[PDB]
Design a protein around this ligand. Structure first.
Ligand SMILES: CC(=O)N[C@@H](CCC(=O)O)C(=O)O
Ligand SMILES: CC(=O)N[C@@H](CCC(=O)O)C(=O)O
Ligand SMILES: [Cl-]
Lengths: 146, 146
């Protein structure tokens, strides 16, 4: 698994293709130029990725991109596990119909159901911070388009 | 479905057998005499039950007991549905053991994992409330043993 702390250390066209293939949508123009990277974890052959970004006090998991054909080998789970070794606190959002939600239910320490989004987190013991994470997920503009 | 607001309106030995059979554990001595019933929903054949009790300000789902046998999933869902029609707000807890966890993940509006409990809620819209409900669950003695 490739660990990067700058976009310069990744193959960005290949990462864009992974994201677009996984989500079956288009990545917004200038995504890499406008997104403050914290850490990314990308499988060697760009079949699964976890992208952490700066969004408030708690690390934000902005993208969990896993190709449908990488699930038999458990590649997305393996990349997630690598991220978690370094990341005791994090939060993220998910569509209500995301096939990954069963995995998220198992992996998360908490959940809050909102209109658009399921909001998940790990490692947060302060409910003011949890409330703020929920607000960030609701407020943060989308980076997938058509 | 039988709806009861007092333990005297239920067959308690039969209910104890349902609870102990569903959980495959023992119900603590004089559970019924020391548990402040809010209301109970019991299927006619005593193969499924939802027990709401008095714990803080929000209805507390103290036992969801459902036999694995003859459409247990269908029956448990039916009883839960009836309870929810009458119960906009509630909270409850579960062990990672508990068979109903997938159902809880799907039915709840949120959860929070703490000290080997998963704490779930519906209809709570103040993190003030949520935190207090988490506190109640973590403090509340176990009533299943061995
Ligand atoms: C964790 C993760 O992949 N979040 C994605 C979900 C996007 C979507 O489903 O539309 C995000 O951009 O926030
Ligand atoms: C919702 C419900 O049945 N809670 C039960 C069982 C918890 C458990 O051990 O899983 C309780 O006594 O709190
Ligand atoms: Cl996977």
């Amino acid at each position: 698994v490739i660990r990067a702390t700058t976009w310069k250390d990744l193959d960005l066209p290949r990462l864009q293709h992974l994201i677009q293939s996984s989500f079956r949508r288009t990545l917004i123009p200038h995504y890499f130029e406008t997104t403050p990277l914290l850490r990314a974890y990308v499988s060697e052959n760009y079949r699964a990725a976890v992208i952490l970004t700066k969004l408030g006090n708690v690390p934000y998991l902005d993208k969990f991109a896993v190709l449908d054909d990488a699930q038999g080998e458990g590649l997305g789970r393996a990349v997630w596990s690598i991220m978690r070794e370094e990341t005791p606190q994090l939060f993220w959002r998910s569509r209500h119909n995301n096939q990954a939600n069963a995995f998220y239910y198992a992996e998360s320490d908490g959940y809050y159901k909102q209109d658009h989004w399921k909001i998940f987190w790990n490692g947060l013991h302060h409910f003011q911070q949890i409330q703020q994470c929920v607000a960030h997920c609701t407020q943060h503009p989308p980076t997938l388009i058509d």
